[PDB]
């Protein structure tokens, strides 16, 4: 049971600073090295460096020394990277991934667990909730879904009845509109019959504007 | 920096056939401890990288034993036995010899599972979204092969065009299908002023232009 | 319940060992003696059943059941003894087995002739590595613990020459610290005014 | 008497485990303790007769089944790390008559962890005798130093001519820990054998210290630059030198 739970998305201004943070569980903190690799939108990968928790030893990608700061608290199995100075091309995803050697072996050049990412959007432009809205089901004998609605920055996430509905369902990759705000459409297909019985709900979530709407779609 | 360089960034293949994906280095790998310290990892849609082989040869733990790896110097190779439905990401090749540690630029993996028509479905705007002056129709496609679609949006029977964009989901793990939501964005004066709304869609696995309608607004 | 005497007892080579042990319930009939070696099983060595003693070989078992009182002495005691010795009894026939917490003894050898000192031995591959050996020591000298984290000190240990008629004790130390010759090894045991420091 | 395998085992959280008890005696009752140096000796498990079982003291993780007469082994579900210790099986022959002894089997030590990455084989070091002893007494003491290794699986052993010595040795009944803090640490552990300096000085005999260690197998899985921890012998050796 290695895990690797990095911090929520966030949204800084040009020539700012962002600290994501990444916290393990289920092993000896200190025992294995730890690295940061980033993936802009619809791009390749790009390593950035790693911390030795053990001894505090460091590396770096040359692009971004002067800039880029990873630190550790071994009281709390926590490592962390700020980069400062930030440009707009600096918009990505920021993975933690950890070495697969244990105690200065040479496997540390490889990583076998990576945490689930954190989206890092550098924009001047506002922050802004989403507004939701049905989708309602066909009057024929089935599909229906939830169309979220201008928000920025990136990124929501979409689940059904608090998560219990899982098969059938397609969420879709979101649409710069010319707005300058995102939107994307969530669907689901379900038997025919049964939309009188079940009671659907979309549950909705911006960390960057700290939104969570429960919306009802259901047929009129 | 080294450059790392994958042969086909792009490689369709049908299910049971060998798959084969080369990579290339401006230098040797050869680090001064002995070993070669080359890799690859595969990314599924919506997950982070995962670890297949590393050090030219060796699976990974978890990795069915059909992936392999093989190469030295400056050439490498990662070679798939039956390819499968659950294969299908993006392969990239990385070196971790030298600093800094670099990767390929990718390499996506179709599947050539065939012919396959979608199941359309119109929505009408929501009640609550037309209270603030904004009406957006949708059109959903589901679960169909090839890639290659076309929507063509009507109102009153009047070809609309530059006032909607589209999205696609990528090639499923299981069914090996796509899904498209195309978007037309009307003002709610405009919505009004029409009623006949319509979703005309064209694909290869169907014989002709099927379309889904409804009328109000 | 069955409890025993406690804690490590320590008894010279030659002199006989006492333990002790005691049950609650008046019902138990079968009385059980066993000597568990470090890191091997326990093996049985005493029975008695009726009251009075039993001898065999240089073990001595005595049971006494209005007192619900059991014993084993161990006469002529060798340092091979060194051992922890559980007391176990039952009631029935096919009634549960208990046994007690279990007895440490340790059996200190006679060493007549005594002459302690420090020497330094080299790895057979390196004669950088090398090893700190205190022997030949008297009984009732005792080696502490390493205060330093990074100086091992192993305790004492009894060997047996069995073609001539030789017992030695034997202590072992080292480091990995340019700081650390044989000369301050054991500083922190109390060891004989008398202990030979060869050149190194 | 009674047999019982393996003698040493190790084992990640989570796996499953079997303890294989054999008797060559016509017993019918049949047990399982387990030692941990706080409370002494524990009843996990007992089986009366064949067919039948029951729960003992410490029962919470364990499942037995009683098959036929002769066998009696022992499941454990998922190895927990409270489950490192040492397992004894035992035998009465439980009939309502003579002879009530239980005898005991050679026991197994069982150690889990976190992660396998933490286990690592013995180094191993012979020292030679000083100079200085063998002026002083007419004896040479040679020491063996077996460092590092996980978990506290080991034989040490001592050989001369080709033929094992017990006469004139003494390994040590624990062994230390390099890190005494922290309870996951390795271990390290001497042995002395001593040999009249004649003896030492022949150089045709030859001295070899052993030390068998018991790891991981090569079915167990492996992503590390070193070499696969596995069940094996580590020595070192010398011979006799005549200055
Ligand atoms: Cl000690
Ligand atoms: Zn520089
Ligand atoms: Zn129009
Ligand atoms: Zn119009």
């Known amino acids: 049971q290695v895990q690797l739970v990095q911090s929520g998305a966030e949204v800084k201004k040009p020539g700012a600073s962002v600290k994501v943070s990444c916290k393990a569980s289920g092993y000896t903190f200190t025992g294995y090295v730890m690295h940061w690799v980033r993936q802009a939108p619809g791009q390749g990968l790009e390593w950035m460096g790693f911390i030795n928790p053990y001894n505090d030893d460091i590396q770096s990608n040359e692009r971004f020394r002067g800039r880029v700061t990873m630190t550790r608290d071994t009281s709390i199995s926590t490592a962390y990277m700020e980069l400062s100075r930030l440009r707009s091309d600096d918009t990505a995803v920021y993975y933690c991934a950890r070495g697969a050697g244990y105690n200065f072996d040479g496997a540390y050049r490889f990583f076998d667990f990576w945490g689930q990412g954190t989206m890092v959007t550098v924009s001047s432009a506002s922050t802004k909730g989403p507004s939701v809205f049905p989708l309602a089901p066909s009057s024929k004998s089935a599909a229906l879904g939830c169309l979220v609605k201008d928000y920025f920055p990136e990124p929501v996430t979409v689940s059904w009845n608090s998560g219990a509905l899982t098969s059938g369902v397609h969420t879709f990759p979101a649409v710069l509109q010319s707005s300058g705000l995102y939107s994307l459409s969530s669907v689901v297909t379900v038997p025919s019959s049964s939309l009188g019985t079940q009671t659907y709900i979309c549950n909705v979530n911006h960390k960057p504007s700290n939104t969570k709407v429960d919306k009802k779609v259901e047929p009129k | 920096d080294i450059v790392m360089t994958q042969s086909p960034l792009s490689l369709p293949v049908t299910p049971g056939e060998p798959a084969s994906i080369s990579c290339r280095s401006s230098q040797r790998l050869v680090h001064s401890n002995g070993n070669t310290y080359l890799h690859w990892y595969l990314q599924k849609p919506g997950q982070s990288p995962r670890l297949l082989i590393y050090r030219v040869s060796n699976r990974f733990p978890g990795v069915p034993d059909r992936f392999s790896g093989s190469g030295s110097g400056t050439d490498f190779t990662l070679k798939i036995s039956r390819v499968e439905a659950e294969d299908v990401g993006v392969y990239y090749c990385s070196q971790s010899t030298h600093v800094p540690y670099t990767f390929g630029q990718g390499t996506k993996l179709e599947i050539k599972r065939t012919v396959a028509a979608p199941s359309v479905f119109i929505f009408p705007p929501s009640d609550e979204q037309l209270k603030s002056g904004t009406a957006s129709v949708v059109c959903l496609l589901n679960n169909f092969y090839p890639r290659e679609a076309k929507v063509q949006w009507k109102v009153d029977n009047a070809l609309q065009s530059g006032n909607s964009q589209e999205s696609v989901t990528e090639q499923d793990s299981k069914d090996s299908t796509y899904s498209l939501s195309s978007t037309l964005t009307l003002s709610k004066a405009d919505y009004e002023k029409h009623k006949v709304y319509a979703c005309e869609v064209t694909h290869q696995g169907l014989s002709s232009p099927v379309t889904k309608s409804f009328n109000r607004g | 319940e069955v409890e025993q005497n406690s804690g490590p007892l320590s008894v010279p080579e030659g002199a006989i060992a006492s333990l002790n042990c005691t049950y609650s319930?008046?019902?138990?009939?079968?009385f059980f003696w066993y000597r568990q070696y470090s890191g091997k099983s326990p093996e049985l060595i005493m029975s008695?059943?009726?009251?009075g003693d039993k001898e065999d070989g240089r073990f001595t078992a005595q049971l006494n059941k209005a007192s619900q009182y059991v014993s084993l002495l161990i006469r002529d005691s060798q340092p091979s003894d060194s051992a922890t010795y559980l007391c176990?009894?039952?009631?029935?026939?096919?009634?549960?087995?208990?046994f007690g917490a279990g007895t440490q003894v340790v059996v200190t050898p006679d060493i007549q002739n005594p002459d302690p000192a420090v020497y330094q031995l080299r790895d057979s591959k390196s004669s950088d590595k090398s090893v700190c050996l205190f022997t030949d020591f008297d009984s009732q000298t005792n080696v502490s613990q390493s205060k330093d984290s990074d100086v091992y000190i192993t305790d004492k240990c009894v060997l047996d020459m069995r073609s001539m008629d030789f017992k030695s004790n034997s202590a072992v130390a080292w480091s990995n610290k340019s700081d650390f010759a044989c000369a301050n090894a054991f500083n922190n045991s109390i060891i004989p005014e008398d202990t030979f420091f060869p050149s190194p | 008497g009674v047999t019982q395998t393996p003698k040493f085992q190790v084992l990640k959280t989570g796996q499953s485990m079997t303890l294989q008890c054999a008797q060559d005696?016509?017993?019918?009752?049949m047990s399982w303790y387990r030692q941990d140096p706080g409370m002494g000796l524990r009843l996990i498990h007992y089986?009366?007769?064949?067919?039948?079982?029951d729960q003992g003291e410490v029962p919470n993780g364990y499942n037995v089944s009683r098959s036929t007469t002769e066998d009696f082994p022992l499941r454990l579900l998922s190895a927990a790390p409270s489950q490192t210790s040492v397992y004894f099986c035992?035998?009465?022959?439980?009939?309502?008559?003579?002879?009530?002894?239980?005898?005991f089997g050679p026991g197994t030590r069982l150690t889990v962890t976190e992660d396998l990455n933490k286990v690592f084989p013995p180094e191993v070091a012979v020292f030679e005798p000083s100079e200085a002893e063998i002026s002083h007494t007419q004896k040479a003491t040679l020491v063996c130093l077996a460092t590092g290794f996980y978990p506290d699986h080991v034989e040490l052993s001592w050989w001369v001519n080709g033929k094992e010595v017990h006469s004139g040795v003494c390994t040590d009944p624990q062994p230390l820990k390099e890190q005494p803090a922290l309870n996951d640490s390795r271990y390290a552990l001497s042995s002395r054998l001593r040999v009249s300096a004649t003896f030492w000085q022949d150089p045709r005999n030859h001295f070899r210290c052993q030390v068998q260690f018991y790891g991981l197998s090569e079915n167990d899985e492996w992503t590390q630059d070193r070499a696969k921890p596995v069940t094996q012998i580590v020595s070192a050796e010398a011979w006799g030198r005549a200055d």
């Open positions: 005696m016509n017993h019918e009752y």
């Open positions: 035992a035998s009465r022959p439980g009939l309502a008559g003579g002879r009530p002894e239980q005898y």
């Open positions: 319930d008046r019902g138990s009939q079968s």
């Open positions: 089986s009366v007769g064949a067919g039948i079982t």
């Open positions: 008695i059943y009726s009251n």
């Open positions: 176990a009894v039952t009631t029935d026939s096919w009634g549960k087995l208990q």
